[PDB]
Symmetry: none
Subunit: 87 residues, 4 copies
Amino acid sequence: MELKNSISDYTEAEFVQLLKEIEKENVAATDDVLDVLLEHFVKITEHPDGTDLIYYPSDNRDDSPEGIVKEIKEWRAANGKPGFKQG
Amino acid sequence: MELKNSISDYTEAEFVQLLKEIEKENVAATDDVLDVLLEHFVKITEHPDGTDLIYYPSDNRDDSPEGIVKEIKEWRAANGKPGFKQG
Amino acid sequence: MELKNSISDYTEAEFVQLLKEIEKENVAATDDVLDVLLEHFVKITEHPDGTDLIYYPSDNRDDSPEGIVKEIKEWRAANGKPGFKQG
Amino acid sequence: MELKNSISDYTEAEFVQLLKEIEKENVAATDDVLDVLLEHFVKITEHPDGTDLIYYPSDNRDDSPEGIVKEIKEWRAANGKPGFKQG
């Protein structure tokens, strides 16, 4: 197992792909994979709003993976915390 | 016959027409009008790629006035920037 | 922190200010801050010449912050890239 | 010209000098320069508490460039990550 524990463990491209899986499982017949991916997303982002980031986007941004990534990046910088794996 | 300050001064159809006009200017005798048009495109879109959206387009997107508009709306939306006027 | 990952995040004045700091750090007894600012400069400008603009000015151009800024301004404009924020 | 891409490029003494300048930059009304140094700090250390290390120090160690450096050193060694250049 090649486990990712924090956001620095990720690159903006790998995180975008994790968000695409979530979108894929959101439309899936069952929520079994979805429930686990949501828990992982909440744990690696450390953002207080949790899954609200996915389900309730602020009016300005959209709920695309890129818009969510931009939201996280901005909030990590604002709070002086490390972001993704820079590349 | 209006001076357009930003993207919110354009409806999407109007912008697609502007792109069509850029195409014709591309084959005109001089670049005098083309250059003013290209500078304006950069100004209103604010996209990092600039005129590359027209000339060295993303492969995962269709090279057409509509493929161009799509990319523009998506990048702006993802980035929290205002889009086109309604029409 | 506030992220400024693009030239459009700076007005020309803020950029001249940035260059003024580089000018100061360039003659300082320590180079630590200088090196961080030089990498930022190259990354936000995207100019193929990089730091040569600061150290090796063209024959009619200056290595003053105002002249380096003018050179970036024209270069991006000529190449269909977005410019400085409003101011 | 080498560019300090990681903590491996810094000896402890250089890093300390870097934090000393960040601490005066707080005196600097150019948050633009300070924000660039802070982004670099967070990037090279990859420590969880990011800028908290400098601003909201744990009252467990000393609030000084040398105290911040010992902690990073400690955390990196505890985490199996590369440390500072020897010198």
